[PDB]
Design a protein around this motif. Structure first.
Motif, PDB file in Angstrom:
ATOM      1  N   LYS A 247     -46.733  38.860  52.130  1.00 44.90           N
ATOM      2  CA  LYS A 247     -47.906  38.160  51.631  1.00 44.90           C
ATOM      3  C   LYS A 247     -47.558  36.790  51.090  1.00 44.90           C
ATOM      4  O   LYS A 247     -48.418  35.902  51.076  1.00 44.90           O
ATOM      5  CB  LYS A 247     -48.587  38.979  50.538  1.00 44.90           C
ATOM      6  CG  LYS A 247     -48.969  40.384  50.968  1.00 44.90           C
ATOM      7  CD  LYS A 247     -49.580  41.190  49.834  1.00 44.90           C
ATOM      8  CE  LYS A 247     -48.591  41.463  48.716  1.00 44.90           C
ATOM      9  NZ  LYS A 247     -47.498  42.370  49.157  1.00 44.90           N
ATOM     10  N   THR A 248     -46.322  36.594  50.641  1.00 45.62           N
ATOM     11  CA  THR A 248     -45.901  35.294  50.149  1.00 45.62           C
ATOM     12  C   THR A 248     -45.184  34.487  51.221  1.00 45.62           C
ATOM     13  O   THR A 248     -45.209  33.255  51.173  1.00 45.62           O
ATOM     14  CB  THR A 248     -44.998  35.462  48.926  1.00 45.62           C
ATOM     15  OG1 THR A 248     -45.774  35.934  47.822  1.00 45.62           O
ATOM     16  CG2 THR A 248     -44.381  34.137  48.538  1.00 45.62           C
ATOM     17  N   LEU A 249     -44.554  35.146  52.199  1.00 46.49           N
ATOM     18  CA  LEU A 249     -44.019  34.406  53.336  1.00 46.49           C
ATOM     19  C   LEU A 249     -45.129  33.765  54.143  1.00 46.49           C
ATOM     20  O   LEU A 249     -44.970  32.650  54.653  1.00 46.49           O
ATOM     21  CB  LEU A 249     -43.203  35.307  54.250  1.00 46.49           C
ATOM     22  CG  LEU A 249     -41.770  35.584  53.846  1.00 46.49           C
ATOM     23  CD1 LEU A 249     -41.740  36.546  52.697  1.00 46.49           C
ATOM     24  CD2 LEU A 249     -41.001  36.106  55.044  1.00 46.49           C
TER      25      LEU A 249
HETATM   26 MG   LIG Z   1     -44.588  37.787  48.796  1.00 47.00          MG
END
Ligand SMILES: [Mg+2]
Ligand SMILES: Nc1ncnc2c1ncn2[C@@H]1O[C@H](COP(=O)(O)OP(=O)(O)OP(=O)(O)O)[C@@H](O)[C@H]1O
Lengths: 390, 727, 47
Positions: free
Chosen positions: A186-188
């Motif tokens: 989700k952060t990539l």
């Molecule tokens: Mg992430």
């Protein structure tokens, strides 16, 4: 409405495997960079009336907040003491930049209008601004192809192809949640958007919108969104929105009501009375079941992206990514881990790779082995009764 | 740590070094079993015989032939490659009869390769006798590399300091993907003519493996027409010969080979692909614009330019042409001929009907129409050659000014001696006018396309030797250098004689001459020393302007290969326009455009927009034309929207409105069917076709106020000559 | 003597990592005693 700022990123030498091609490419980067530095040093080293006017300008210029301009040369300003004054206006100001609430500049002694400071953004937001280009382009995002396609439609395509939508009157989505378990990308998928997006990227953390002073949170949020709209056709990444996003309840304390106020101001910004410019919100969360329908609504958050624990093919591709830069041993088949249907995250695959390299290093070796992968999985994994079914 | 058994092994080593010689050699050499270990690093005997390194080295120094002195060198040299002990001891060991490397590891192989390399650099052309043993070495190592898939390292050894053929000749088969693409990249980024060395190396690989529709395009990178025919000769399969002929045209069975080479049917292919997703629609300027979403001859020119740039080569005039007012020149006649590009069939009829017509602005336009239509297609029955050679021979502007560019359009990129003899004697233009001489040089160069033609070079040199002091530094005399540059492309250092000859020209001028010759020379390949020279010649402050302009255009042209280089050049040009003089600022947009024509990346678009609304109208014009050039042949989105915003901002600015509408016409150019991009093949060819047109366009736009807002407009149709299809 | 105002010179070309290589390639391709008297005039500046 100054215009997009984005970030400065140097080009990326395609090869990763240690190669003389990589050396040559990187020395190309080096030589152009040295050339830029030369030009700078050379030209800026090798190579009156306004000077005295700015001297007349008070050297320790203070900042006030204008209020109710009057006449053509006599404007009311304030001070950071709660006091305010009917100050004079010099001939150095461009004029027409003076609006109520404008953070104006003033002379130390005379206390006149001697500037407009049309650049005042709160430090708590300018630090959150993004100017680095984190090297996480859409190449290390193993699998997740559908999620990347959706996020690309949401973020990129109304910038690099604003014809598809205008051809048919539709308007691009404004918000996207990325929600799911602990470690999925989700952060990539935000980092890669930062990489390939020529638009400003704005970090945000839900735990950063809760401010000590009562009423300061639903002013920091306004500052954030005003900076986003003014400064760029941009993207705003509210990581860990579950830090403020919990369902609004009646509450009986002050802090909870203040947090709810921050939520309400966020919602008013996302879809308030007036409008929203070209600011696209990307929100992240570990649990979507603990959020307010107000912000999960499909007018502020037009897309929702699950990040389910990656399936078998995605898990394979993830081992591929996170071992590509490693000296593998031919006796290693990256399928023993694949076949087992044990809950494995992308972060878990990364940790398995790292730990395996470590076990090899302890074995006095610099190239992984099958036994090393087995031990790495066994010592990395952290955590229905038998016979109740079947 | 030192586990008990490890310490016992250490004590064995201590006894071995402290203690006749046959057992010592035997067990010391067998202790390299640690390195041969398929699964291990930190070879224990290495770093266990660390304190004994000096003792062993001095023993070898005080050693003489015999039972010893043979296998101890192996241990000496492994301890060396660990620490100290260079190729002197390495090759003493190898003469110790152990070159196989089988009893040693991949680590030792790579270390040996690096050591051989570093001795080679340390050495010069002297003591070349040592090379021959080292060449036999490299020959012995490379098979080991092709065995253990260290193809990058083998190619490293080959490229090292020089060029090598033996390996890539003996690189087996069906595993050449690496030696193909990876060496193609190394080639793309080489700094020297050992570029061309690696070029024909890869070509030889392809030829040995009898599959060379990649040496196909490599031929053009190898500036050797002789090599072009050499590749063309074999062509054992007619099926692949057809594709080769098509590629040659875009850049046994003799009935169709020359036909495909000349592209007598490329119009048919283009029209078929147009029918595929048909867009055939004679249009109106406003639709390309959006004036509903908001009769000067200037508006006439803008409308004609947009209409032609969009409907080029679709075969669809005097009625709408008739609206002329002074500057209402042959622009629109050329526009009609262009809309009829590559349509010789009806081109003859229409151009004849509109040549049997009114004064110069209707006959020079007809000749330019013939030439521009003939651009890109050739035939044995030469078209328009008779008209060009017979008509318009008198000394005057307009007529020849258009006719010579028409002939260049007809036969650019041919180096044909007939048209060369037509144009070189006619180059004598002290009798004729200055702009006419300029356009004659333009056509001569555009036909030379880097042929290095001694005759045309002599014509240009003698023309520039003819010097009028005041004429030189006024305007419209720079196309002699332009033609010289076109005659000499990317030949390397074979320009010093020309530079020395030109060094006689007057000081205030000839800065452009030297810079444009140099840039039309080496370019696209990418030379850091050369771009250093370009940046420095920019960097000398002058308290000339067009000299920095040509330098900027050169930085653009040189940084057109490597995309890494292109991006870094974008950074440099931002710096340049930031800390730059007005001339430098005006020049920067041209360089941006050359870097990214028809590839509208948001970064370049944003930078040009931010620099658009400038105090200098010349800067503004350069920026908006840069927008047009980045968006050319793409229909890209939001470029038109922001550009209409720019126009509405410059509502009442005549020149700005004209040029911005031209940028919109470029944006909708070819409806996407034609792109100005150079590098037609594998994005890796400094395409002799359309580079001349693009460079002429950029040189002319180096000064827009004087020429573009002057008495000439053929720059746009030169850009069209550069145009090419995208299908 | 009048200090000859020197030209505003730049920094060197710096190592582009093939500058020395190019220079080497180009190079290879190219391949009163003071007296012991004064004899002062009649008004002598005799220190
Ligand atoms: Mg992430
Ligand atoms: N598809 C993927 N490919 C490679 N690495 C991945 C992938 N998905 C996740 N990762 C790993 O995710 C780690 C970063 O954490 P990640 O983005 O997964 O966290 P999250 O739980 O989704 O979000 P947050 O950081 O807000 O808690 C990186 O180390 C990367 O290795």
């Amino acid at each position: 409405t100054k215009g997009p700022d984005a970030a400065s990123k140097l080009p990326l030498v395609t090869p990763h495997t240690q190669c003389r091609l990589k050396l040559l490419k990187l020395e190309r980067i080096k030589d152009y960079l040295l050339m830029e530095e030369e030009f700078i040093r050379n030209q800026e080293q090798m190579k009156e009336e306004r000077s005295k006017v700015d001297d007349l300008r008070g050297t320790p210029m203070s900042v006030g907040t204008l209020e109710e301009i009057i006449d053509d040369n006599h404007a009311i300003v304030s001070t950071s003491v709660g006091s305010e004054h009917y100050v004079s206006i010099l001939s150095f100001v461009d004029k027409d930049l003076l609006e109520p609430g404008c953070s104006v500049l003033l002379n130390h002694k005379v206390h006149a209008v001697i500037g407009v400071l049309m650049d005042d953004t709160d430090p708590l937001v300018t630090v959150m601004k993004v100017e680095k280009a984190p090297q996480e382009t859409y190449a290390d995002i193993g699998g997740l192809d559908n999620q990347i396609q959706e996020i690309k439609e949401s973020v990129e395509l109304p910038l690099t192809h604003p014809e598809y939508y205008e051809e048919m009157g539709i308007k691009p989505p404004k918000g996207v949640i990325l929600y799911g378990p602990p470690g999925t990308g989700k952060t990539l998928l935000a980092k890669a958007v930062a990489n390939q997006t020529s638009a400003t990227f704005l970090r945000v953390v839900g735990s950063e919108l809760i401010q000590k002073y009562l009423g300061d949170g639903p002013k920091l949020v306004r500052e954030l969104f005003r900076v986003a709209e003014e400064h760029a056709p941009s993207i705003v990444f509210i990581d860990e929105i579950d830090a403020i996003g919990t369902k609004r309840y009646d509450s009986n304390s002050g802090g909870e009501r203040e947090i709810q106020r921050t939520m309400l101001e966020l919602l008013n910004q996302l879809d308030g009375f007036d409008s929203r410019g070209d600011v696209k919100v990307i929100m992240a969360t570990n649990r979507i079941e603990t959020l307010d329908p107000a912000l999960i609504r499909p007018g502020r958050i037009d897309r929702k992206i699950e990040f389910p624990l990656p399936d078998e093919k995605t898990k394979k591709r993830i081992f591929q990514i996170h071992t590509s830069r490693m000296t593998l041993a031919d006796d290693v088949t990256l399928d023993d881990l694949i076949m087992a249907k044990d809950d494995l995250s992308g972060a878990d695959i990364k940790a398995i790779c790292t730990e395996a390299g470590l076990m090899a290093l302890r074995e006095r070796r610099m190239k992984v082995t099958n036994e090393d992968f087995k031990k790495s999985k066994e010592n990395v994994l952290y955590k229905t009764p038998e016979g109740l079914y079947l | 740590e030192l586990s008990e058994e490890d310490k016992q092994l250490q004590d064995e080593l201590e006894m071995l070094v402290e203690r006749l010689y046959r057992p010592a050699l035997e067990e010391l050499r067998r202790q390299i079993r640690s390195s041969t270990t398929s699964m291990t690093s930190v070879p224990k005997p290495l770093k266990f015989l660390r304190p004994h390194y000096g003792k062993l080295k001095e023993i070898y120094e005080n050693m003489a032939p015999g039972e010893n002195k043979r296998f101890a060198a192996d241990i000496i040299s492994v301890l060396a490659m660990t620490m100290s002990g260079e190729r002197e001891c390495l090759k003493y060991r190898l003469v110790g009869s152990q070159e196989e490397l089988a009893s040693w590891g991949h680590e030792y192989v790579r270390h040996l390769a690096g050591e051989v390399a570093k001795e080679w650099q340390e050495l010069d052309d002297a003591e070349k006798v040592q090379r021959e043993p080292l060449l036999t070495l490299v020959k012995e190592i490379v098979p080991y590399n092709m065995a253990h898939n260290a193809e990058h390292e083998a190619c490293d050894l080959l490229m090292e300091i020089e060029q090598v053929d033996m390996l890539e000749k003996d690189i087996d088969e069906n595993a050449y993907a690496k030696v193909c693409l990876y060496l193609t990249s190394c080639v793309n980024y080489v700094p020297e003519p050992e570029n061309s060395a690696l070029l024909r190396c890869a070509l030889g690989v392809f030829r040995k493996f009898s599959r060379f529709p990649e040496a196909l395009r490599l031929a053009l990178m190898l500036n050797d027409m002789e090599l072009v025919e050499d590749i063309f000769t074999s062509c054992k399969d007619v099926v692949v010969q057809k594709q080769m002929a098509f590629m040659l045209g875009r850049h046994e069975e003799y009935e169709d080979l020359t036909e495909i080479m000349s592209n007598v049917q490329l119009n048919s292919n283009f029209l078929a692909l147009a029918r595929e997703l048909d867009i055939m629609e004679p249009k109106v300027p406003d639709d390309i614009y959006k004036t509903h979403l908001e009769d000067s001859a200037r508006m006439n020119l803008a409308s004609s330019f947009v209409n032609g740039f969009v409907n080029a080569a679709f075969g669809q005039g005097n009625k709408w042409l008739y609206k002329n007012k002074d500057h209402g020149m042959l622009s629109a006649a050329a526009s009609l001929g262009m809309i009829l590009l590559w349509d010789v069939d009806g081109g003859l009829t229409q151009i004849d009907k509109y040549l049997y017509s009114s004064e110069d602005y209707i006959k020079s336009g007809a000749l330019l129409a013939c030439g521009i239509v003939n651009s890109g297609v050739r035939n044995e029955c030469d078209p328009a050659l008779a008209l060009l050679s017979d008509y318009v021979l008198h000394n005057s502007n307009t007529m020849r000014l258009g006719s010579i560019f028409g002939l260049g359009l007809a036969y650019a990129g041919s180096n044909r001696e007939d048209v060369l003899t037509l144009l070189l004697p006619v180059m004598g233009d002290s009798k004729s006018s200055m702009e006419v001489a300029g356009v004659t040089a333009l056509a001569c160069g555009m036909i030379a396309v880097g042929s290095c033609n001694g005759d045309v070079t002599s014509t240009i040199l003698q023309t520039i030797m003819e010097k009028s002091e005041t004429e030189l530094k006024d305007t419209y005399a720079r196309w002699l250098p332009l033609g010289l540059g076109l005659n000499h492309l990317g030949k390397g250092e074979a320009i010093e004689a020309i530079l020395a000859a030109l060094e006689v020209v007057s000081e205030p001028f000839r800065s452009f001459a030297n810079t444009l010759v140099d840039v039309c020379a080496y370019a696209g390949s990418g030379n850091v020393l050369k771009v250093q020279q370009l940046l420095h010649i920019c960097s000398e402050h002058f308290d000339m302007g067009a000299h920095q302009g040509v330098a900027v255009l050169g930085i653009a042209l040189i940084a057109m290969g490597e995309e890494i280089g292109a991006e870094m050049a974008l950074r440099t040009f931002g710096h340049l326009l930031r800390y730059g003089e007005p001339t430098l600022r005006r020049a920067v947009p041209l360089a941006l455009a050359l870097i990214s024509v028809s590839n509208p990346r948001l970064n370049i678009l944003d930078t040009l927009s931010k620099f658009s609304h400038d105090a200098d109208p010349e800067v503004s014009y350069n920026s908006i034309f840069a927008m047009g050039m980045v968006g050319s042949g793409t229909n890209n989105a939001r470029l038109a929207a922001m550009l209409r915003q720019l126009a509405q901002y410059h509502a009442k600015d005549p020149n700005n409105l004209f040029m911005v509408r031209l940028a919109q016409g470029l944006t909708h150019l070819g409806k996407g069917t034609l792109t100005l991009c150079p590098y037609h093949s594998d994005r890796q060819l400094m395409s002799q076709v359309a580079v001349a047109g693009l460079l002429t366009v950029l040189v002319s736009f180096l000064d827009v106020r004087n020429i573009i807002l002057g008495k000439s407009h053929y720059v746009l149709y030169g850009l069209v000559a550069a145009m090419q299809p995208r299908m | 003597e009048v200090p000859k105002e020197k030209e505003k010179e730049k920094v060197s070309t710096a190592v582009l990592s093939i500058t020395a290589k190019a220079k080497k390639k180009e190079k290879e391709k190219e391949k009163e005693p003071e007296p012991n008297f004064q004899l002062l005039d009649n008004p002598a500046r005799v220190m």
